[PDB]
Amino acid sequence: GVPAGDVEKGKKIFVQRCAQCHTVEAGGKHKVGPNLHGLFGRKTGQAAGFAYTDANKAKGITWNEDTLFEYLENPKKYIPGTKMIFAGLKKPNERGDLIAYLKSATK
Numbered sequence: 001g002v003p004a005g006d007v008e009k010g011k012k013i014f015v016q017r018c019a020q021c022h023t024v025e026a027g028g029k030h031k032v033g034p035n036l037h038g039l040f041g042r043k044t045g046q047a048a049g050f051a052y053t054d055a056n057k058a059k060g061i062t063w064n065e066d067t068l069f070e071y072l073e074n075p076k077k078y079i080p081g082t083k084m085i086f087a088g089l090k091k092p093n094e095r096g097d098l099i100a101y102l103k104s105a106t107k
């Protein structure tokens with residue numbers, strides 16, 4: 001599974017790599033990417049008000065630690081045709097820290 005991460009290290013990764021396109025809090029706005037509030041336990045393509053690709057909506061998995069850990073390593077391999085332009089976070093410790101941050105920040 002996915003080892004526990006450091007939320008402060010994960011917050012720094014989020015601001016430097018994700019915040020350009022995403023907010024996390026309840027009521028945060030959509031940007032190039034969807035607001036991520038309520039991410040854990042919900043299916044792909046479900047944030048109210050955001051226009052997703054068919055690729056994202058078709059994936060149909062439930063976001064959680066394990067699916068995020070795979071996705072964030074290589075987004076386009078996990079969801080071919082997604083419009084999220086993000087190379088990938090290769091290091092497992094960095095993915096784990098970011099995931100820990102998301103688990104709290106999107107609660």
Ligand code: HEC
Pocket residue numbers: 014017018019020021022032033034043044045046047051052053055056063072081082083084085086089
């Ligand atoms: C803008 C250049 C982006 C960056 C940088 C990151 N993301 Fe993104 N993300 C973006 C878009 C346009 C979309 C929608 C893709 C589609 O095909 O419609 C997404 C989607 C995600 C998702 C899925 C959300 C869902 O509701 O299904 C996740 C979990 C996500 N993005 C996470 C994420 C993180 C943690 C990032 C930093 C490592 C990140 N994204 C960067 C656009 C952009």
